[PDB]
Ligand binder design. Structure first.
Ligand SMILES: Nc1ncnc2c1ncn2[C@@H]1O[C@H](COP(=O)(O)O)[C@@H](O)[C@H]1O
Length: 226
């Protein structure tokens, strides 16, 4: 369609930054292939491939899969997608992945969502479970009537170790350490576009207006016929 005009883009953002929502809306409104490296890894795992076994090992220890493995897997998929616009998501995560990618394809725009630390920390530590019933409470959307207590039984709620504040802080500092070199690398290339905000619905209009200058709105499903 857009003949020598295909978008090679990447989207970046901390866990809890709303990146997942913004990636959904981009794919809802524009004609592009969204390649998510976490989804490639889940599929390989689901299919029980050798990279699926390798990956599950690391992901269980919350580590990054080595750069060469991750780069090979992604580059193999992009080989197939050259005729489409694409949005890469979760890759590059490290500076060897970004340098490697640059030897194979020219990346035109990297979208970075910059949301304050405390906002991301509040999102990621918000979930509590009542173990007996499976009832979930999210402090932002449906808080219990008394904190740490199940509404219906009065029994205590618990939080997974992953959702605890200290664990979350640790994950965010690691993500920052990892991706800060990547952002600086795209910033020297002049391809980094940063969108800052505290709510995803205030950031989205700007990302939408920015990609509309770049690519084809998916033909017309106006579903809010309001
Ligand atoms: N670009 C990447 N490099 C290395 N590991 C990755 C990458 N993308 C996904 N993963 C991993 O898969 C896990 C979940 O990915 P994510 O869906 O992006 O949180 C991460 O903790 C890493 O173990």
């Amino acid at each position: 369609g857009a003949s020598a005009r295909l978008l090679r883009a990447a989207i970046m953002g901390a866990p809890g930054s709303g990146k997942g929502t913004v990636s959904s809306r981009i794919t809802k409104h524009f004609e592009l292939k969204h390649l998510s490296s976490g989804d490639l890894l889940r599929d390989n795992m689901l299919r029980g491939t050798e990279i699926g076994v390798l990956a599950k090992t690391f992901i269980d220890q919350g580590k990054l899969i080595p750069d060469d493995v991750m780069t090979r897997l992604v580059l193999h998929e992009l080989k197939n997608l050259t005729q489409y616009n694409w949005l890469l998501d979760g890759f590059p995560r490290t500076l060897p992945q970004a340098e490697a990618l640059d030897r194979a394809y020219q990346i035109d725009t990297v979208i970075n969502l910059n949301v304050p630390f405390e906002v991301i920390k509040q999102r990621l530590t918000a979930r509590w479970i009542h173990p007996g019933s499976g009832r979930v409470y999210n402090i932002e959307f449906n808080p219990p009537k008394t904190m740490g207590i199940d509404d219906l039984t009065g029994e205590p709620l618990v939080q997974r170790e992953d959702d605890r504040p200290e664990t979350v802080v640790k994950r965010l500092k690691a993500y920052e350490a990892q991706t800060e070199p990547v952002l600086e690398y795209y910033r020297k290339k002049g391809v980094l576009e940063t969108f800052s905000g505290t709510e995803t619905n205030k950031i989205w209009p700007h990302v939408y207006a920015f990609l509309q200058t770049k690519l084809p709105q998916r033909s017309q499903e106006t579903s809010v016929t309001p």
